[PDB]
Design a protein around this ligand. Structure first.
Ligand SMILES: [Mg+2]
Lengths: 131, 292, 251, 145, 242
RNA sequence: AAACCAUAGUUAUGACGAUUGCUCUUUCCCGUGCUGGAUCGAGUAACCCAAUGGAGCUUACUAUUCUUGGUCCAUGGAUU
RNA sequence: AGUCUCCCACCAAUUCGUAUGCGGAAAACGUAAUGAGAUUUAAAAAUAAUUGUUUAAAUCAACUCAUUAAGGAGGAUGCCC
């Protein structure tokens, strides 16, 4: 008669204090994954690299990563520790945790990417509760 | 309300002259701290106890809060305090704290030895006790001493901003922080960020995550950063500005003009506060009935 | 002294399990003590007179406070019933129609001009308030104010743990140890105010009108106003905790 | 409030990895072929360095920093291959996993690290070691017949 | 008592004849398992779903524990059981389980594709579900299929041996075992050691600490491992007898 | 050469899972109300830890860092 | 927890042979009625233990000290009667 925590969302954002370098150099979705893997490998060993996570709604220095409820601490402690050095830009990059959510109710814009993610996870939430 | 009390100043001895690049980097990091969000920032000035202290008063404080920081605060919107850390190893005879404590606001210590630690915990009138997280601990810290010092005043400070410096330093930092939290009974803990550039700064949630991974609960971290920081600021402000907590030269009418809050109004070269007459005898006592 | 020490070491290796401990923890006493463990008449007169005067003045102050507390209630109820709002009306009415009940009520109109000026002059000459304000000393003035006498002073409650005690001005008649005694006025209020000192903030303003209109903004703190020196100095102070002042920063 | 320690007992067992030689199937024969001896190149600082390397390689930086605060080898001798390592009660499972993940020595190959007894006192560890040593002699005496 | 259910046999196909060196290495590793302390051993034999099954009953199992391990059984004092896994990829070259269920004791499966998982959760009289922990998982472990196959009685098998092979596959094994733990919700988890060499077998304490640090609670590890291994052995023996 | 003896006994009192009960807040119902029932949540704290046994006294504890009972010539609002 | 006190062998008695407000083997132990007291005091501070603050000093509340030996009978007063 309780609820099982599947995972937890994490609102990340690369925050580098140099507009002259930010407007020049571009950031894509593979950069985020490479930075995450490098951070995990530099701060932890295989324990940190074996963290399950995906990418949702990738934007310009904005990303939403879902991390399991069991390793939320391991994720949030390695995020606030590592600083990128010589990955893709001469200027080091760091990430700031905007907010966290465990119920999918979060407010950014009037877009519908959240909406179709909610569609999929609705037809999967009812499925997981029924089965 | 968030307070950061360990912003280092790019200078260690009075023989040094700070260039414009360092103060510009400090301006940039203060703007960075104001961007994401912060309320109180007190910069630190580290100096050693063994060497002779200059026999001056108007040359002991190389911060100049009014000239440059006073020029930027009207655009920033926060306040700055001057703090000094006395790194003491052996009980030498050079000791003139009666001037440095009155010239500065908050006085902290960084002991390396056990005798210096004992004398700073018992006799030295200080506000915060900081340990060298870069180096090893002097000896095995006891419980009763730290608890009696917390009940007597001075609390311990944890500097999570040092762990971003090197690779081998994180192990010693964690080994010192865990021992300090175990020996201090998690009562008198104040957290600070010792970053010299805006590149090593984090959000309040990152600090909470790091500290809760270290071993201290999150609610206690928020409590210590909200009320224990304001109280340790008030202690160092009232012990200097006012007398020994009997008469305060600051009068709070509402909720903004407080001895720690109101900093531009209260004069500092003296301790007077020239305010126009607002209290005579012909006004009605009951504030609900008193109308202008 | 090597041999007898070695012999007693061989003696301890039979009884004890680690023979070298009592010498390191210093448990083997080299010595044990064997000793059983070991113009006056007028002075008396004036001391008795002072004790009697104190014991009488305490009861007199208590009875005065009780009389004032009862008379305020009685006169306020009579005024509310009497269809009377103004003070100049109620005062004259109870003068003509209630002779006795008027001898006990106080008169703040005469309590203001004597007390306020005699305190202001004394504080002005004590703190050396001069036509020029370039001859001041902050720490010394704070020490003087901590040593100063506050009998007959005007103080305003600016901050307090209770949201209702703030904003009260009054001239004190006696300085107690737990409560603070003042007198306040309104349209019909002549309440003798007994206010707690544990958790309140006071303030007193000194008018200065040499050429411009200026005033010094000073304040006291009741919580630590109880452990101060009186009329002199040279008392050993202790750091208490400097922690129960959260109400100061909270609001 | 009180420093809680926890000691771990581990043993080095050498499996008879030799497919060209057939082996006898019994209790004491395999006990003797598994408890033969430890090599000469065996020390306390050589096993501590190896386990520290393995821990830093498997767990990571913070995972090794949190366990290396009170990670010491209290008693160990190469004659029987039984060692007692001290650690905290919070990171004991991590030390056990590191002992399990021990691959090989820098010069000696083909060995297994087996954690036998873990407790928060050295007296009970010594008692269990004496009991195990006494139990070992029984099968030996029985098989010598 | 401890139970191991994943000892592999050095033979993939049926045309593959056994080698005396392989039998000696298997004897060595079983002796090492009994040395570290174990009671129940269940050797596994791998076969492909594409290979032709023999038209025999007296020849389905190229093990014959009675003639080979029957001497070790009454000398050292342990037991051996028959187990076979099924490397299933697509619905073809199959449709036969009633004759393979009578010879062996435990029947497992190894799905590696999309339809393989569906066919494993649909109509396969299996007991354990095994994934390729060395390489990548097929698509994604979801709750819709795992919950449904665990509620009927089929458990998920975790191979802690594949980790001790090389250094690179350790990351994939960890990323797969944590996904399996997150999807199964930690109810039907059975563990086995898929090692063929006596140098890659560990004890109960190390394995327990590993699975505890990897995401399984200390109650789940012990209870699941012990009681579920005993129960799968029991139901296998029962379906073999009757 | 032992006297070796604890419904914990020599600084051990571990790892999680599940159930009931308590505080406030969120809503519903019969009949205002009920040690009323049912969800949506949080909290179950702080002081501190035995080393032979018992009694007395003093000193630390309970602020979104669990609670309970009463008192107050303490103040704040309302009726007579 | 605490540098506090005491019991853990007896002694028709150089052995606190102590019928002393009550209970108690003892306690630098609990509590009850009355009067007084504040470095001008029996004693607390601004020339044995414990406690961050460490009794009071309008009234109440709290601390300290100074008195009240157990049981039975007669008279007087006050209450239900
Ligand atoms: Mg003790």
């Amino acid at each position: 008669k309780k609820t099982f925590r599947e995972w937890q969302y994490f609102k990340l954002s690369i925050t580098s204090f140099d507009q002259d370098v930010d407007d020049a150099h571009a950031i894509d979705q593979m950069t985020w994954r490479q930075w995450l893997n490098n951070a995990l490998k530099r701060s932890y060993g295989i324990f940190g690299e074996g963290v399950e996570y995906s990418f949702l709604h990738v934007d310009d220095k904005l990303a939403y990563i879902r991390v399991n409820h069991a390793d939320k601490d391991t994720f949030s402690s390695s995020i606030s520790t590592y600083i990128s050095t010589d990955e893709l830009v001469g200027s080091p990059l760091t990430v700031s945790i905007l907010q966290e959510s465990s119920s999918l109710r979060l407010l950014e814009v009037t877009d519908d990417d959240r909406l179709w993610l909610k569609k999929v996870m609705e037809e999967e939430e009812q499925d997981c509760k029924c089965i | 309300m968030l307070v950061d009390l360990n912003v280092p100043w790019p200078q260690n001895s009075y023989a040094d002259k700070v260039t414009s690049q360092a103060v510009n980097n400090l301006i940039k990091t203060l703007s960075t701290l104001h961007m994401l969000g912060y309320t109180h920032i007190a910069i630190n000035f580290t100096v050693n106890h063994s060497e002779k202290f200059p026999n001056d008063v108007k040359l002991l404080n190389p911060i100049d809060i009014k000239r440059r920081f006073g020029e930027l605060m009207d655009r920033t919107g926060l306040k700055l305090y001057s703090r000094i850390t006395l790194i003491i190893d052996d009980p030498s005879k050079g000791q003139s704290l009666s001037k440095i404590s009155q010239a500065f606001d908050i006085v902290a210590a960084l002991p390396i030895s056990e005798k210096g630690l004992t004398l700073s915990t018992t006799n030295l009138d200080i506000d915060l006790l900081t340990f060298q997280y870069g180096s090893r601990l002097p000896t095995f810290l006891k419980h009763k001493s730290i608890c009696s010092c917390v009940n007597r005043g001075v609390k311990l400070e944890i500097v999570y901003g040092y762990a971003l410096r090197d690779v081998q330093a994180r192990r010693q930092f964690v080994s010192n922080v865990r021992s300090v939290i175990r020996s201090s009974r998690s009562r008198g803990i104040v957290i600070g960020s010792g970053a010299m550039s805006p590149l090593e700064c984090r959000n309040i949630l990152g600090v909470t995550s790091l500290i809760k991974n270290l071993g201290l609960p999150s609610d206690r971290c928020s409590k210590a950063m909200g009320d224990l920081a304001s109280l340790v600021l008030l202690n160092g402000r009232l012990r200097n500005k006012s007398h020994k907590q009997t008469i305060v030269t600051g009068g709070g009418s509402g909720n903004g003009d407080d001895v720690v809050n109101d900093v531009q109004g209260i004069d500092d070269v003296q301790t007077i506060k020239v305010v126009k007459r607002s209290m005579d005898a012909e006004q009605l006592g009951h504030a609900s009935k008193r109308h202008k | 002294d090597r041999t007898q020490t070695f012999i007693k070491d061989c003696l301890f290796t039979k009884c004890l399990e680690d023979p070298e401990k009592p010498f390191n923890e210093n448990r083997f006493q080299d010595t044990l003590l064997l000793l059983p463990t070991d113009e006056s008449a007028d002075k008396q007169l004036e001391k008795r007179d002072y004790q009697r005067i104190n014991k009488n003045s305490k009861i007199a102050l208590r009875e005065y406070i009780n009389n004032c507390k009862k008379n305020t209630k009685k006169c306020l109820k009579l005024a509310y019933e009497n269809k009377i709002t103004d003070k100049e009306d109620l005062l004259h009415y109870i003068e003509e129609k209630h002779p006795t009940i008027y001898e006990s009520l106080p008169q703040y109109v005469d309590f203001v001009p004597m007390y306020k000026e005699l305190w202001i002059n004394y504080i002005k000459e004590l703190l050396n308030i001069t036509k020029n304000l370039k001859t001041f000393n902050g720490s010394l003035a704070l020490l003087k104010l901590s040593m100063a006498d506050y009998n007959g002073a005007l103080l305003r409650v600016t901050k307090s743990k209770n949201k209702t005690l703030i904003g009260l001005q009054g001239i004190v008649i006696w300085d107690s140890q737990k409560f603070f005694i003042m007198i306040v006025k309104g349209n019909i209020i002549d309440e003798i105010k007994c206010i707690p000192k544990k958790g309140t903030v006071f303030q007193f303003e000194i008018p200065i009108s040499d050429d411009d209109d200026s005033a010094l903004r000073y304040s006291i703190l009741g919580d630590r106003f109880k452990y101060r020196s009186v009329d002199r100095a040279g008392r050993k102070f202790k750091s208490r905790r400097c922690d129960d002042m959260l109400y100061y920063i909270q609001n | 409030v009180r420093l809680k320690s926890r000691y771990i007992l581990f043993e080095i067992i050498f499996p008879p990895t030799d497919t060209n030689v057939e082996e006898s199937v019994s209790k004491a024969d395999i006990l003797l072929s598994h408890h033969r001896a430890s090599p000469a190149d065996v020390s306390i600082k050589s096993i501590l360095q190896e386990i520290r390397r393995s821990l830093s390689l498997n767990l990571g930086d913070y995972g090794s920093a949190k366990c290396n605060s009170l990670l010491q080898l209290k008693y160990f001798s190469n004659k029987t291959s039984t060692g007692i390592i001290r650690c905290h009660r919070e990171d004991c499972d991590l030390v056990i996993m590191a002992l399990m993940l021990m691959s090989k020595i820098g010069d000696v190959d083909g060995l297994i690290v087996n954690p036998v007894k873990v407790s928060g006192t050295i007296k009970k560890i010594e008692q269990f070691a004496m009991r195990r040593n006494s139990k070992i002699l029984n099968i030996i005496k029985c098989s010598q017949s």
